[PDB]
Amino acid sequence: STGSATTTPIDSLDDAYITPVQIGTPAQTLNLDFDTGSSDLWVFSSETTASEVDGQTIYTPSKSTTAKLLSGATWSISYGDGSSSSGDVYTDTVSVGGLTVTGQAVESAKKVSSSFTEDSTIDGLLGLAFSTLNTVSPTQQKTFFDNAKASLDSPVFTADLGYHAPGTYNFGFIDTTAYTGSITYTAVSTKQGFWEWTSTGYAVGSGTFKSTSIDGIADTGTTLLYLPATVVSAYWAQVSGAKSSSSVGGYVFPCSATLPSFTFGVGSARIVIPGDYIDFGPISTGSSSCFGGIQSSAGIGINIFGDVALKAAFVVFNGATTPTLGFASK
Numbered sequence: 001s002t003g004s005a006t007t008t009p010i011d012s013l014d015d016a017y018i019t020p021v022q023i024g025t026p027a028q029t030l031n032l033d034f035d036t037g038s039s040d041l042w043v044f045s046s047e048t049t050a051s052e053v054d055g056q057t058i059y060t061p062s063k064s065t066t067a068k069l070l071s072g073a074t075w076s077i078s079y080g081d082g083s084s085s086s087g088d089v090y091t092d093t094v095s096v097g098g099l100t101v102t103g104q105a106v107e108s109a110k111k112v113s114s115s116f117t118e119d120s121t122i123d124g125l126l127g128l129a130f131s132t133l134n135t136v137s138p139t140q141q142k143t144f145f146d147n148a149k150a151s152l153d154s155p156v157f158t159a160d161l162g163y164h165a166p167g168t169y170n171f172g173f174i175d176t177t178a179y180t181g182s183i184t185y186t187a188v189s190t191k192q193g194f195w196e197w198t199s200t201g202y203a204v205g206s207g208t209f210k211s212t213s214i215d216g217i218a219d220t221g222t223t224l225l226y227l228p229a230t231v232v233s234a235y236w237a238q239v240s241g242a243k244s245s246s247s248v249g250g251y252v253f254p255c256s257a258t259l260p261s262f263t264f265g266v267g268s269a270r271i272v273i274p275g276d277y278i279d280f281g282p283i284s285t286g287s288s289s290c291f292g293g294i295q296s297s298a299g300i301g302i303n304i305f306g307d308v309a310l311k312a313a314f315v316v317f318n319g320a321t322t323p324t325l326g327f328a329s330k
Contacts, residue, residue: 001151002172003099007034007161010121013280014307015223017161018121019169022095023106024064030057030123034169035221036159036195036317037304039133039143040077041094042085042107043124044116052112055120061108067092075107075135080222080300083115089136094144096126099171101148105134105141125221128157128317133193145171145319155319159220160330161311163277179314179328184269188323192302194219195317197325199305200267202227204235205260209270216303218315218325224280225262225273226297226304235262235294242292248283251292255282262294264309266327273312 007019018031023043030043044053046060061067067090076086087110094104109124116122127134131142149155152172160178161167168178189196194217203209214227232251236242238260242253253259259275278293293308316326 001099001148002153002170003095003097003148004168004170005097006166007169008166009162009164010119012164014161014164014311016122017167017220017307018123019096019126021126023059024061024092025066026064027095028057028059028064030059031121032124032126033122033221034126034128034159035219036128037217037219037221038077038079038125039127039129039131039193040075040107040135041105041124041126041144042075042077042087042109044112045087045108047087048109049111052117054117057123059106059108059124061090061092061106064092066102067106070105070136070139073105073136073139073141075137077135080304081115083113085109085112085116087111089141096144096171097169099148099152101144104144104147105136107136128220129195130190130193132190145317148172149319157317157319159310159315159317161220161307163274163311167311174316179330181329182269183314183316183326183328184266185316185318185324185326186266188325190323195323195325200265202231202265203263203270204238205275207238209263209265211265214264214303216297216305218305218310218317220307220310222304222306223308224304224306225278225294225308226300226306227294228303229296229298232294232296235260236292244296248289248291250295252283252289253292255288255290257290264305269327271309271313271327271329273309277308277312
């Protein structure tokens with residue numbers, strides 16, 4: 001089997017991407033944030049504290065003839081950005097782009113943090129990291145991909161995120177029309193539960209490539225590119241007037257600037273992030289100070305190849321017995 005679904009930016013900055021997901025019988029379609037940095041499929045629901053729901057579409061398990069309460073199971077998650085959610089668990093039928101999993105754990109939120117409430121466009125998350133990170137207790141549950149894998153034509157999914165435009169998540173096949181050149185595959189460590197890999201270096205603009213190992217995670221659920229302070233300083237030094245602002249929470253730059261590209265290495269291959277992908281617009285409405293899309297990972301504890309990096313590539317998440325990651329230009 002295979003599946004193919006369009007993923008759409010939630011706003012004009014590509015702050016996140018939403019993908020429609022069918023849950024239950026009859027189908028209830030919710031728009032979920034596919035997150036290769038976490039491993040829970042959780043949704044706003046009829047059980048979510050009413051004051052914490054503001055415009056989201058909810059899953060109502062009592063209206064699904066295939067929903068079953070997973071007795072005694074609870075979940076609770078905290079994300080790198082400080083947001084969180086928790087609740088109980090149903091199993092139900094879940095379909096993405098024509099690919100169907102029966103008995104998928106659907107984690108129903110009883111509580112969500114303010115950041116989730118305040119974002120009316122995201123109805124929940126669909127985790128695509130390794131199932132070892134799943135938070136369901138006392139019996140850990142499998143991700144949608146893990147459940148689907150054996151049925152797929154090939155045990156893979158691909159992320160093809162757009163810049164200021166829709167893109168695609170495919171399951172079970174590689175669309176050879178969706179990228180240019182070849183896909184370069186690179187080793188993955190699953191030791192921390194992430195799609196963790198080592199970039200071979202970087203360049204800023206038309207500058208020389210610096211060969212250096214950068215361990216980080218391919219994370220579709222993180223907006224920006226978080227890299228070591230040395231790398232980030234070298235990038236922003238090429239933008240007149242750019243500075244790190246403790247008050248704003250990262251590098252800012254004059255909105256009048258033209259940003260240089262940023263290249264990262266995948267083995268001997270190179271992925272080029274155009275400068276415009278690194279512009280996250282005014283820090284507040286009407287400001288001429290703009291927020292940068294490349295930020296320091298210092299104090300995160302891990303480097304994160306988030307959407308800024310991934311959307312410059314066609315990315316293969318290869319869930320073979322020994323997982324790997326593939327990157328192609330597009």
